Amino acid sequence: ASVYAWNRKRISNCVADYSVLYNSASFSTFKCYGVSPTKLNDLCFTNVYA
Amino acid sequence: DSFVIRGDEVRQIAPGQTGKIADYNYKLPDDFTGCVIAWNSNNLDSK
């Protein structure tokens, strides 16, 4: 999307793989705030919004 | 310690950092005391 009207997808009712995302060489930056990208695999959430 | 990696993965070479280089290949101590020195070598190492 254009940033004036960004996409937003609720993620829910599913099993994540923040490990395969954090290990993807695609990303120029992966900066995390209030969480560390490793711990996302052991911590978990009521919902996630992308 | 001396080695080659793809430049964007230099980001992983720190105490407390992680990913396929920093976990699956070469891990620093999380109290590491030392200097990390890195540079682009495209002129020599690419073909």
- Asked whether the beta carbons of residue B9 and residue A25 sit closer than 8 angstroms, the reply is yes
How many angstroms separate the CA atoms of B44 and B41, rounded? 6
Q: Are strands A10-11 and A48-49 parallel, antiparallel or unpaired?
A: antiparallel
Q: Per DSSP, what are the bridge partners of residue A48?
A: A11
Phi, psi (deg, nearest 5) at residue A34? 65, -5
Q: Is A23 on the interface with B (CB under 8 A)?
A: yes
- Asked whether the beta carbons of residue A28 and residue B8 sit closer than 8 angstroms, the reply is yes
User: Min CA distance, B7 vs chain A (Å)?
Assistant: 11
Q: Per DSSP, what are the bridge partners of residue A49?
A: A10
How many angstroms separate the CA atoms of B30 and B46, rounded? 32
Smallest Cβ–Cβ distance between A23 and the set B6, B8, B20 belongs to B20
